[PDB]
Amino acid sequence: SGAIYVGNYRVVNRHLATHNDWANLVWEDSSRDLLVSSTTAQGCDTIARCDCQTGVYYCSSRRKHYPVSFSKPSLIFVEASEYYPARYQSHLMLAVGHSEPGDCGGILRCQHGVVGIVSTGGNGLVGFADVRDLLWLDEE
Numbered sequence: 001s002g003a004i005y006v007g008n009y010r011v012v013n014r015h016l017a018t019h020n021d022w023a024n025l026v027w028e029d030s031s032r033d034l035l036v037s038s039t040t041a042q043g044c045d046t047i048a049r050c051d052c053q054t055g056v057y058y059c060s061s062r063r064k065h066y067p068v069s070f071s072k073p074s075l076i077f078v079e080a081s082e083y084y085p086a087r088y089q090s091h092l093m094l095a096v097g098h099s100e101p102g103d104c105g106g107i108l109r110c111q112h113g114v115v116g117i118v119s120t121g122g123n124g125l126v127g128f129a130d131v132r133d134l135l136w137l138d139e140e
C-alpha cells in the first residue's frame with residue numbers, strides 16, 4: 001500500500017483505490033495502474049520533473065529503501081494477477097529489486113522529488129508507474 005500526496009491530490013495504484021477515492025475522482029488510467037483523487041488537506045510530496053534513471057524506492061516487504069537504476073517509461077508486457085490478467089502496462093519503468101505481493105504504492109524518488117510508485121514485479125524485478133509527465137499535479 002501507499003500513496004503520493006501532492007497539493008490537493010492523492011495518487012494511488014488504481015487497483016488499490018478505495019470507495020472514497022472513486023467518489024472523489026480526478027483522473028484514472030487502467031493501462032497505467034494509476035488513479036488520482038482529491039483531498040481536503042494539502043500534501044507534502046513534490047513531483048520530480050526530469051529524465052533521471054537512478055533513484056531510491058521503498059520496499060514494505062523489507063522495511064527498507066533501496067537505491068536502483070531504472071529504465072525509461074515504456075510499454076511492457078506484464079503477466080496476470082488477481083487484479084489483472086496479462087497485458088501491456090504503459091508508462092512503466094523496470095529495475096532489479098526485490099518485490100513481492102503487497103509492495104504496490106511504495107515511492108520511487110530521485111534528487112528532484114517523487115518519480116512514481118510501485119506497480120509490478122517479480123523474479124527480483126520491481127516495476128514502477130511513472131508520474132513525471134502528469135504536469136497538472138503541480139497546480140489547480
Ligand SMILES: CSc1ccccc1CC(=O)N1CCC[C@@H]1c1cnc[nH]1
Binds near residue numbers: 081
Ligand atoms: C510489485 S507487485 C508484484 C511483485 C512480485 C510479484 C507479483 C506482483 C503482483 C503484481 O504484479 N500486481 C498486482 C496488481 C498490479 C500487479 C500486476 C500487473 N499486472 C498484473 N498484476
Ligand SMILES: [Zn+2]
Binds near residue numbers: 052111
Ligand atoms: Zn530526477
